[PDB]
Amino acid sequence: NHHTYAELMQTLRFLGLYRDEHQDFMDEQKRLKKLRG
Amino acid sequence: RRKALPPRTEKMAVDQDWPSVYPVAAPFKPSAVPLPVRMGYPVKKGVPMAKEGNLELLKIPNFLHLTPVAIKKHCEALKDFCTEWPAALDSDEKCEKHFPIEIDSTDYVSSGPSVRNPRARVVVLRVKLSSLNLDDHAKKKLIKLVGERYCKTTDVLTIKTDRCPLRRQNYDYAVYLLTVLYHESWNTEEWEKSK
Amino acid sequence: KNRAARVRVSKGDKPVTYEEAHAPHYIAHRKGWLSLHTGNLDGEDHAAERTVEDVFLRKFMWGTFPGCLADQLVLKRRGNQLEICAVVLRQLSPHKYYFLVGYSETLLSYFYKCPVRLHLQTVPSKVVYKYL
Amino acid sequence: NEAGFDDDGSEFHEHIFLEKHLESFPKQGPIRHFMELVTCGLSKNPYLSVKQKVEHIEWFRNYFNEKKDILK
Amino acid sequence: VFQDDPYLMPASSLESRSFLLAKKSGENVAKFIINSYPKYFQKDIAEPHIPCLMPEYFEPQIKDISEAALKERIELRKVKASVDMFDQLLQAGTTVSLETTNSLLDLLCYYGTWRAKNNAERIFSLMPEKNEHSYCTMIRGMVKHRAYEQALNLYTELLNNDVYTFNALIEATVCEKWSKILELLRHMVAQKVKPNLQTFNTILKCLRRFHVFARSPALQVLREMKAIGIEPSLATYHHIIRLFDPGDPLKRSSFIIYDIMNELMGKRFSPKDPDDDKFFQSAMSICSSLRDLELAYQVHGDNWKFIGPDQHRNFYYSKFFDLICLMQIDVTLKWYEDLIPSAYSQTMIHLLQALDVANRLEVIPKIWKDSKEYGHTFRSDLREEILMLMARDKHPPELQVAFADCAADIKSAYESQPIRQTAQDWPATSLNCIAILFLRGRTQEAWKMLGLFRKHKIPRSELLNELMDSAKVNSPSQAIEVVELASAFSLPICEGLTQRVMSDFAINQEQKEALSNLTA
Amino acid sequence: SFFTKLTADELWKGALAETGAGAKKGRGKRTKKKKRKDLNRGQIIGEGRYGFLWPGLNVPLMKNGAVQTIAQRSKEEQEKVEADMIQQREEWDRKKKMKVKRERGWSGNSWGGISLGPPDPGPCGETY
Amino acid sequence: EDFIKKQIEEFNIGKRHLANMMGEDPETFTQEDIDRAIAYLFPSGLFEKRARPVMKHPEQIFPRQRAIQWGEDGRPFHYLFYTGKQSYYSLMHDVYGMLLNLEKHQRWLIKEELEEMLVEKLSDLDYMQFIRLLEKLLTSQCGAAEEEFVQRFRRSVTLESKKQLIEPVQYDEQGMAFSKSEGKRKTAKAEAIVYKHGSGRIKVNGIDYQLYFPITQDREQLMFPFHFVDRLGKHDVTCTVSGGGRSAQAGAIRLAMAKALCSFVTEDEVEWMRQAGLLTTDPRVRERKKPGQEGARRKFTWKK
Amino acid sequence: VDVPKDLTKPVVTISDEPDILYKRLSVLVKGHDKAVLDSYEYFAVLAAKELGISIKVHEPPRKIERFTLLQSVHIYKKHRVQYEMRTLYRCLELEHLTGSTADVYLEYIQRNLPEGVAMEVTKTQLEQLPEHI
Amino acid sequence: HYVDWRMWRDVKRRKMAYEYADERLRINSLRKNTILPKILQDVADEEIAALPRDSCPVRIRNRCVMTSRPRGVKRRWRLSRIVFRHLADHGQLSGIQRATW
RNA sequence: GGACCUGGCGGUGCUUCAUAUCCCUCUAGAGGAGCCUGUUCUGUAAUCGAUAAACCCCGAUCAACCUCACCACCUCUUGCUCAGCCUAUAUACCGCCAUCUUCAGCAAACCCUGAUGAAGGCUACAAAGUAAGCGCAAGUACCCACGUAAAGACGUUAGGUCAAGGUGUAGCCCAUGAGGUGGCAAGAAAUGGGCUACAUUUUCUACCCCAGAAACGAUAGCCCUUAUGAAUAAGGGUCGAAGGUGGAUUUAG
Ligand SMILES: [Mg+2]
Ligand SMILES: [Mg+2]
Ligand SMILES: [Mg+2]
Ligand SMILES: [Mg+2]
Ligand SMILES: [Mg+2]
Ligand SMILES: [Mg+2]
Ligand SMILES: [Mg+2]
Ligand SMILES: [Mg+2]
Ligand SMILES: [Mg+2]
């Protein structure tokens, strides 16, 4: 289940051990989008 | 900042217990291995890459462990544990005389966490009717009942068992089936007498 | 013109490794497979599960040892035993290295209900096959 | 391939011979025909055990005893 | 357990300790994540179900006084037990079972300090039904967690109304007391308890220190143990060996115990006492005082588990190698070069002095290189020792190359660390021999190194000899611009220059000779 | 999903669009360029939402010669850490994008009065 | 340069370690033993030897490179250094000197092998002119040193047998002399035993050819070997076959009969049969079908 | 110099019942690398020799499974790319082999398997007639 | 966190067909049987018709796991052709080479 | 505007060639009739994309219901998603391929000539070119060393694909998102690729090859049976025509 997989990886990123590059990318672009409107 | 100590190549002597330094299956570990064995397609007037960065030796399966000396040692160790085969049983005719009923099962083994696989259940067995039936009426009855389970060229009656998932279920069901089959071939019927 | 697991020829400013250099049609002729299992052979099964789980393992370990690796991994599954082999750099401290080793070992073992173990080989700088 | 999962010490005859579980119908009707074919298929099936087979036949009992209206 | 590559290779005891502790911390982190999110690993993908791999469940169920009481002994804590006692005494006022009350008291005594005082004063409200088990467990708790007068009062109460219960009671009574000890032993042997000798072990632990008037009676008490035929002589024997501790070694008793432990080693061992870990360490501590090599070999199937803690293993190996060094030493260095990677300053000092007394000069370089490879850096005690011992020598002419090499490596290590300020006083102490060895092929290096030394001094007689030999070993100006400067610096170089200037130095130029005359 | 996620360099290539249709012919684009940025090098491995104290990588393993234990970074502590990281990222971005002042020679946007500095050293060794 | 000696001594130490681990004395030891040990201790599914794991001696691993051609300071050693191709031109100079000396008195070597014998590249043109100089040298009489110089470069012709194998006769009960042979085909494989003393009938899988081959061209092919040799009714044969195609089995039986008869018949007639061309396995096989093609060779209709 | 004094051996008990007699143990190794299969075969045959039992060897043929995939993504039917898995068989028969010998040998070999290989046992044991017959 | 809503629907259908598998099997046997009453066949057919939607094992599709591509998927590996070619070229999985025969 | 460098182009000259490619040549076919399956077009409320060479049994190694992305109707608003979108942009892209390629050149780094211009660098009985590296090649796979596969770079076609998947930009974020019922998926027509036969080398019968009869053709339609499914495919009876070997042109070897 992608449920288990993605939930595990999200919780572990919140722990701060798995440096998810794709998640970093998405977060930075979301930040820039909400900054520029 | 910190520097890694040099490998065990210069440390290891020519006289060394390789079966002891590599007891079980393990990767190449070039830092511990002293051999300069290289593997990799060289460039024009080039050479294969050194063992330190040669991860292809790790890619390939590993057999540095289990040297011939190690094999000899383990066989000499387990010689006292393994047993001996009876000298009287030294031929196929003799062994099939002593124990006519042949029976054989099988199963695979594959890499992975799970181990169950339904093919574990199937089994087969064989017996020649040349010496076991001891009669003619029951023999004709049995050969009329069985359709393809026999072979008269080699003269063996073979039967398989897979109806049950458990190996011992298959085994004892085959045994009970053979027993009831013999007991029902023993007797006869009036419509069987009329042919 | 085919583009499949190959490097674009540059001026000579691209360090490439053995695997990243050689072509995929050279895989059996001049390379080995990153995984070693029997699900692909005839009669076996769970090959899809093997591939999915090993891809997930590769991703998870690449991201839990980030910035230290310099090449693909070597998986070696002997029956029940699972063996991993990695090549890394001496960026961080051996404290961190062993801590993450134990962490990943425990996670993989509890996740797959399988005996897992791994080896890591240190390199000062990533080996290069050529400069393309 | 069977270290554990011994099927609760079940037996080949408990799997195959369902005449002990066939009690509440004679040996001529179409219900008998259907249930005999059911027992046949179940004995041929190794994947499921005596528990599953008795659950099958019990659900069948419930079914046709709730649809006892016809008996034709 | 440690990896194979050289970078991850733990090359020192403290760092290896920290490393496997980090691994254990990762194991605990794994436990935490699994018991915090069980549902993720709930899938039993593996065909064989394994509770060792299943997630762990310390979750109290719904309010149910009976099932909650049954779950008390499953949860292994004290707040649940407080709440259950509350629910059973305040509103219910009934006991689910005397066995449940006994188990609650067991847990609360094991968990125990004002908190212990409260936990012990909240057990007297328990229903009248308090049998021996309850009383003696209360005694256990009050002994192993609180003072001893309470345990004594509880024992008197029980008398008014077990092996390790009476063991704890004897511990409480003991912890000079001749009549006490005697009457205790007498009535204990009189009762039909027939202890497992753990009472004897505990009274020995309490007798850890005493004079002969209880050290020697321990021998007859042990003979009685043997007569009854119970003890394997695993812990009490070792404790009396330790009690033997000492103004004068007792060679007779030493030989006796040697034979005893010799037959103990000859026979096979089985563990019964949790205190067999101090056995190893303190045994080797006594062995170090004894100083015997056949003894060390005797002290050397699966009996290697009793070492355990890295601290005790360290003490053992240290004393072992120390005795082996201070015992030819070819077999000793063989054993050493065999166990160095497996094994982990004082040991190296003993090694250096052993090599000195042996006169095996060629071996010290490899040992220093191994120590440096492992963890020998940022400390110059052993550097000073090796330098002094190696340049007390000059007898190998060809080995002067190795002298120069190891000296260069030592200086490369010495000059690493400015920020720490520790490298400033290292040359003042050990630069003399280093520069002598550098002089003994390459000479310009030693020349400029003595320059740096004197321009940092603490002159020395062997420093004067070094200067003299260097000057005499062709170039008047090159020798003068050093010897004359050091003479103008200090007086002994000047009294040496008085003779140096005779051969060819004073004829060159008189300004430096004039400076020498002025300083003289 | 996580299986759909992948490495960083692929995403950077797809976002930058360095080649394929627009870079070739010299047509390029209207002076819009996305600047490469490295995120993995920036933050320490331990940083996350739940600020558990990690003696292995985030905290020194030993303190006062005493082994450490897992602990919690509470709300205002993790908020301070997040503010520090925001300030650090803003500082890195400021240092990243700045002016470039090549001395004005004969005219702006002209390479007339520009000097490249002395020649490079020779192979055999020749300083100019 | 010191890396060479480093690798050499380290390779010797590794060879001693290899002998120790495999478990024989290091006194006697060989490179075939090296390669067997490497193949056993580290197998590899790689097809190319250059890619497979190989523990080789460094002198043969590293290609020889020219050392420093000039001293630490000043002039170079060889007297053509200020031009390239110094070795080639010095050799050509010596050759021309020998030519003019012989004048006043009065197989070949491959380009790549020559370039590797030297350490200098070259061109096909200068290679050709060097071969021409050698031919000009050999047109005239030349002495022992000159012949040795020429044979230093010349290599073995390495000629092939150009001969047909003769199978050994065999003897069975009855004192029956005979000879067995085997033939193959596209998908058919057969074995035929020829009895010389017997003659007349022929059996195929236990059935005569007259009814085993309803078609007559198969029997014509079966007769073609005997007809060419002209021994028709003086030899009998039996044969077993396993194949799919009729003509396939026919050709297989023909080849087997010929490969069995070449033993009995003299070498002259064996040569005559070889010239006839019936003693070679047919290399022609149905080509593979390609994914984009409707067949092995045909393309889809060009739609434009 | 560190050589143990007394090597502790495991306990062994001879049960009163008789051991089973395996008529023939036929093992089949399916692999990808002929060299790995040859190494494994040498290993097994040397082990069987040193244990003192019979053995025969033969190399069954190579089996292959291949399949075609679309080379490109959207629209290319004629341009395909092919793939194939090659499985290589190696069979080994052991004759007249006691039950305990079978257990110890199979345990050893199964622990000393390589990775990319699958192992198939066919056990053939004889037995006399039952008592009901 | 499935890849998309169609994957969500597919998994829902899979679980529904599973949890109604044996029931559908029993009633389908009772329908397709021949000697039993035709009125009983019609009863069982009406029962199947009244059964809920998304319970039949034919509405499911053997879709891909990685990219959610329904077409071009192997039943053995369950992976799309594109991702399979990718992994085989990068050498991720074991024992596949190019068919240069 | 005068004169030049490079490339393209020449219904531009000379020479050497064209391997199944140009032809003359050899063979079998496509445009005749029917059927299957795509494309164009008509209408429907009813996807989408490529749609010359280099698409047209193409995405698809599958669409009765999911596959469904279309449409009508009916519902959800933090909505499995620390949301989602098959919405636009292939003229932002990655990833993956067609193309010349059934080629062999591409080229960092140096030098030289041209008055130090764009640019060029070939003469072997040799006159300024030297070349990293890539590619070709070699070796590897099948049965060989040949052959077939595989490989086949730099780059053109802003070539195809935001609909394998992700992603930059711009939008919906009570929706341009999501869920469940239903149908949509026909042909007055044109075109394409394949199958069938138009014959007697044919058709039927046992065998697959020494025989005996006739003097053919339905994989379309109607009815029925069976296969799985909860709800097209194979088989049987009847119908027994068009069809008489192709209207220019053209394909493959
Ligand atoms: Mg301006
Ligand atoms: Mg292609
Ligand atoms: Mg549909
Ligand atoms: Mg939509
Ligand atoms: Mg485009
Ligand atoms: Mg080629
Ligand atoms: Mg091709
Ligand atoms: Mg376009
Ligand atoms: Mg149906």
Long-range contacts of D3-7 (CB under 8 A, 24+ apart): D3/B115, D3/E48, D4/E47, D4/E48, D4/E49, D5/B116, D5/E47, D6/B166, D7/B165, D7/B166, D7/B169, D7/D49, D7/D50
Q: Which of I74, I77, I82, I72 is nearest to I94 (CA)?
A: I77
Q: Are strands C116-123 and C74-78 parallel, antiparallel or unpaired?
A: unpaired
Interface test with B, best of H105, H126, H128, H133 (most B CBs within 10 A): H126
Q: Running DSSP on this structure, what letter comes out for residue H27?
A: E
Euclidean distance between CA atoms D60 and D39, whole angstroms: 12
Euclidean distance between CA atoms F109 and E155, whole angstroms: 102
Q: Which residue has the tokens 């590996």?
A: I77
Q: Are strands C130-131 and C15-16 parallel, antiparallel or unpaired?
A: antiparallel
Q: Running DSSP on this structure, what letter comes out for residue E361?
A: G
First to last CA, chain F: 59
Q: Are E226 and E260 in contact (CB under 8 A)?
A: no
Q: Which residue has the tokens 């291995």?
A: B33
Judged by a CB distance cut-off of 8 A, whether residue E26 touches chain F is yes
Cα separations in angstroms, B145 against B148, B149, B150, B195, E404: 10, 10, 11, 14, 99
Residue type, E177: K
| Chain I hits for F4, Cβ within 8 Å | 3, 66-67
B122 contacts: CB under 8 Å, gap ≥ 6: B105, B106, B160, B161, B162, B170
Euclidean distance between CA atoms I10 and F38, whole angstroms: 39
Q: Which of G268, G284, G256 is nearest to G163 (CA)?
A: G268
Residue B107's DSSP bridge partners are H121
| CA E126 centroid distance within chain | 47
> Smallest CA–C1' separation from A11: which nucleotide?
J82
- Give the residue ranges of DSSP H helices in A1-37: 2-15, 21-36
**Residue A16 three-state SS:** coil
> Is there a contact between F1 and I1 if contact means CB atoms under 8 Å apart?
yes
Residue type, G15: K
The string of DSSP letters for B70-119 reads HHHHHHHHHTTTS----TT--SHHHHHHH--EEEEEEEEE-SSS----GG
Q: Are G260 and I73 in contact (CB under 8 A)?
A: no
Judged by a CB distance cut-off of 8 A, whether residue H8 touches chain E is yes
| Chain C hits for H110, Cβ within 8 Å | 79
Euclidean distance between CA atoms C103 and C123, whole angstroms: 22
The alpha-carbon gap from I56 to the nearest alpha carbon of chain C, in Å, equals: 25
The alpha-carbon gap from H31 to the nearest alpha carbon of chain B, in Å, equals: 11
What chain B residue is nearest to H45 in terms of C-alpha separation? B71
Q: What is the largest CA-CA distance in chain H?
A: 76
At H28, list the tokens. 């089949």
The number of beta carbons lying within 10 Å of the beta carbon of residue F126 is 9
Q: Are B59 and C33 in contact (CB under 8 A)?
A: yes
I48 part of a folded domain: yes
What chain D residue is nearest to B173 in terms of C-alpha separation? D12
Euclidean distance between CA atoms D6 and D3, whole angstroms: 8
Euclidean distance between CA atoms I38 and I40, whole angstroms: 5
What chain I residue is nearest to F3 in terms of C-alpha separation? I66
Q: Ligand 3 mean position to I59 CA, how many Å?
A: 9
Solved how? cryo-EM
Counting as contact any 3 or more CB pairs under 8 A, the partners of A are C, E, F, I
F65 contacts: CB under 8 Å, gap ≥ 6: none
Cα separations in angstroms, A15 against C67, F48, G187: 19, 5, 66
| Chain C hits for A21, Cβ within 8 Å | 63
Task: Choose the closest CB to H68 out of G40, G44, G291.
Answer: G291
Judged by a CB distance cut-off of 8 A, whether residue I43 touches chain D is yes
Euclidean distance between CA atoms D2 and B168, whole angstroms: 10
Q: Are E50 and C107 in contact (CB under 8 A)?
A: no
Q: Are I25 and I61 in contact (CB under 8 A)?
A: no
I11 part of a folded domain: yes
Residue type, E90: L
Q: Ligand 1 mean position to B187 CA, how many Å?
A: 119
Angstrom resolution of this structure: 3.5
**Residue B146 three-state SS:** coil
Q: Ligand 4 mean position to G103 CA, how many Å?
A: 96
- Phi, psi (degrees; rounded to nearest 5) at E289: -65, -40
**Residue D1 three-state SS:** coil
Q: What 3 state SS string does G211-240 have?
A: HHCCCHHHHHHHHHHHHHHCCCCCCEEEEE
By residue count, chain B amounts to: 195
Euclidean distance between CA atoms G236 and I87, whole angstroms: 61
C98's enclosing H/E stretch is helix C94-112
Q: Ligand 1 mean position to F18 CA, how many Å?
A: 29
By residue count, chain G amounts to: 304
- Give the dihedral sign, CA C14/C17/C20/C26: positive
I98 part of a folded domain: no
At G222, list the tokens. 């079966």
Counting as contact any 3 or more CB pairs under 8 A, the partners of G are B, C, H
Q: Are G248 and G258 in contact (CB under 8 A)?
A: no
Q: Are E138 and E105 in contact (CB under 8 A)?
A: yes
Euclidean distance between CA atoms E50 and E44, whole angstroms: 9
Number of domains forming the structure of chain I: 1
What region, left, alpha or beta, does residue G200 occupy, with left being phi > 0 and alpha being psi -120 to 50 degrees?
left
- Distance from residue G301's CA to nucleotide J242's C1', rounded to whole Å: 27
I41 part of a folded domain: yes
Cα separations in angstroms, F110 against F29, F98, F114, F115: 22, 21, 8, 12
Residue type, E160: N
Q: Are F11 and A25 in contact (CB under 8 A)?
A: yes
At B184, list the tokens. 């029902």
Q: Running DSSP on this structure, what letter comes out for residue I73?
A: B
Euclidean distance between CA atoms E276 and E293, whole angstroms: 23
Range of the domain at I55: 1-91
The string of DSSP letters for chain F reads -TTT---HHHHHHHHH--SSSSSGGG---SS--PPP--STTTS-TT--SSEEE-TTTTS-SEETTEE---EEE-HHHHHHHHHHHHHHHHHHHHHHS----PPP-SSTT--SS----SPPPPSS----
Q: Running DSSP on this structure, what letter comes out for residue B41?
A: P
Euclidean distance between CA atoms I89 and C6, whole angstroms: 9
The string of DSSP letters for C34-61 reads S---SSSSTT---HHHHHHHHHHHHHHH
Q: Ligand 2 mean position to H84 CA, how many Å?
A: 18
Residue type, I32: K
Euclidean distance between CA atoms C27 and C33, whole angstroms: 7
Q: Which of F18, I1, F8, F6 is nearest to A28 (CA)?
A: F8
Q: Are F52 and F72 in contact (CB under 8 A)?
A: yes
- Distance from residue G128's CA to nucleotide J127's C1', rounded to whole Å: 21
Residue type, E493: I
Euclidean distance between CA atoms I91 and H83, whole angstroms: 13
| Chain B hits for H43, Cβ within 8 Å | 63, 66, 71
Euclidean distance between CA atoms E505 and G187, whole angstroms: 104
Q: Which of G166, G196, G177 is nearest to G279 (CA)?
A: G166
| Chain H hits for B132, Cβ within 8 Å | 129
Euclidean distance between CA atoms E92 and E64, whole angstroms: 12
> Smallest CA–C1' separation from I63: which nucleotide?
J67
- Phi, psi (degrees; rounded to nearest 5) at H80: -120, 170
> Is there a contact between A3 and I3 if contact means CB atoms under 8 Å apart?
no
| Chain F hits for E21, Cβ within 8 Å | 61, 67
- Distance from residue F101's CA to nucleotide J32's C1', rounded to whole Å: 82
Question: Residue closest to J252, CA→C1'?
Answer: G298
Q: Ligand 3 mean position to I12 CA, how many Å?
A: 17
Q: Are E378 and E417 in contact (CB under 8 A)?
A: yes
Task: Choose the closest CB to E338 out of H1, H6, H8.
Answer: H1
Task: Choose the closest CB to G45 out of H32, H68, H80.
Answer: H32
What region, left, alpha or beta, does residue H96 occupy, with left being phi > 0 and alpha being psi -120 to 50 degrees?
left
| Chain H hits for B182, Cβ within 8 Å | 133
Euclidean distance between CA atoms C85 and B59, whole angstroms: 9
* Half-sphere exposure of residue B106: CA atoms within 13 angstroms, side-chain side: 20
Q: Are strands G202-204 and G236-242 parallel, antiparallel or unpaired?
A: parallel
Q: Running DSSP on this structure, what letter comes out for residue B12?
A: S
Q: Which of E339, E329, E336, E251 is nearest to E295 (CA)?
A: E251
> Is there a contact between C96 and F56 if contact means CB atoms under 8 Å apart?
yes
**Do chains E and B touch by CB distance (3+ pairs < 8 Å)?**
yes
| Chain G hits for H87, Cβ within 8 Å | none
- Give the residue ranges of DSSP H helices in E359-502: 364-374, 381-390, 400-414, 425-439, 444-454, 461-472, 476-489, 491-500
- Distance from residue F29's CA to nucleotide J169's C1', rounded to whole Å: 13
Tell the burial category of H84 from Cβ atoms under 10 Å away from its Cβ (0-12, 13-18, 19+): middle
Cα separations in angstroms, B74 against B22, B82, G7, H109: 13, 12, 35, 12
Euclidean distance between CA atoms E96 and E286, whole angstroms: 55
Which ligand is in closest contact with the Cα of F21?
A: 5
What nucleotides of chain J have any atom within 7 angstroms of a protein Cβ? 29, 49-50, 52-63, 65-69, 80-86, 90-101, 108, 124-126, 131-134, 139-145, 148-161, 164-170, 177-181, 192-194, 208-210, 228-231, 250-253
Euclidean distance between CA atoms C64 and C101, whole angstroms: 9
| Chain C hits for F56, Cβ within 8 Å | 95-96, 99-100
- Distance from residue D64's CA to nucleotide J44's C1', rounded to whole Å: 50
I101 part of a folded domain: no
Residue H117's DSSP bridge partners are H31
Long-range contacts of G130-138 (CB under 8 A, 24+ apart): G130/G88, G130/G92, G133/G92, G133/G95, G133/G96, G133/G99, G134/G95, G136/G99, G137/G95, G137/G98, G137/G99, G137/G102
Q: Ligand 9 mean position to I26 CA, how many Å?
A: 18
Q: What 3 state SS string does chain G have?
A: CHHHHHHHHHHHHHHHHHHHHHCCCCCCCCHHHHHHHHHHHCCCCCCCCCCCCECCCHHHHCCCCCCCCECCCCCECCCCCCCCCHHHHHHHHHHHHHHHHHHHHCCCCCHHHHHHHCCCCCCHHHHHHHHHHHHHHHHCCCCHHHHHHHHHHCCCCCCCCCCCCCCCCEEEHHHEEEEEEEECCCCCEEEEEEECCCCCCEEECCEEHHHHCCCHHHHHHHHHHHHHHCCCCCCEEEEEEECCCHHHHHHHHHHHHHHHHHHHCCHHHHHHHHHHCCCCCCCCCCCCCCCCCCCCCCCCCCCC
The alpha-carbon gap from H1 to the nearest alpha carbon of chain E, in Å, equals: 6
> Is there a contact between A19 and C66 if contact means CB atoms under 8 Å apart?
yes
I19 part of a folded domain: yes
Q: Are E152 and E172 in contact (CB under 8 A)?
A: yes
Q: How many contacts (CB atoms, under 8 Å) link C and E?
A: 68
Residue type, F5: K
**Do chains F and H touch by CB distance (3+ pairs < 8 Å)?**
no
Work out the angle between the directed axes of helices E98-111 and E79-86 (0-180°, nearest 10): 140
Sheet architecture: strand order including G202-204: G170-172, G176-183, G189-195, G236-242, G202-204, G207-208
Question: Residue closest to J228, CA→C1'?
Answer: I58
Q: What is the dihedral of CA B182, B184, B189, B192, to 10 degrees?
A: -50
**Residue B30 three-state SS:** coil
What residue ranges in H52-116 does DSSP mark as E strands? 56-58, 62-70, 80-98
Which ligand is in closest contact with the Cα of I59?
A: 3
Q: Ligand 5 mean position to F20 CA, how many Å?
A: 9
Q: Are strands H80-98 and H117-127 parallel, antiparallel or unpaired?
A: unpaired
Q: What is the dihedral of CA H92, H94, H98, H104, to 10 degrees?
A: -30
Euclidean distance between CA atoms B49 and C21, whole angstroms: 13
By residue count, chain C amounts to: 132
What chain F residue is nearest to I2 in terms of C-alpha separation? F1
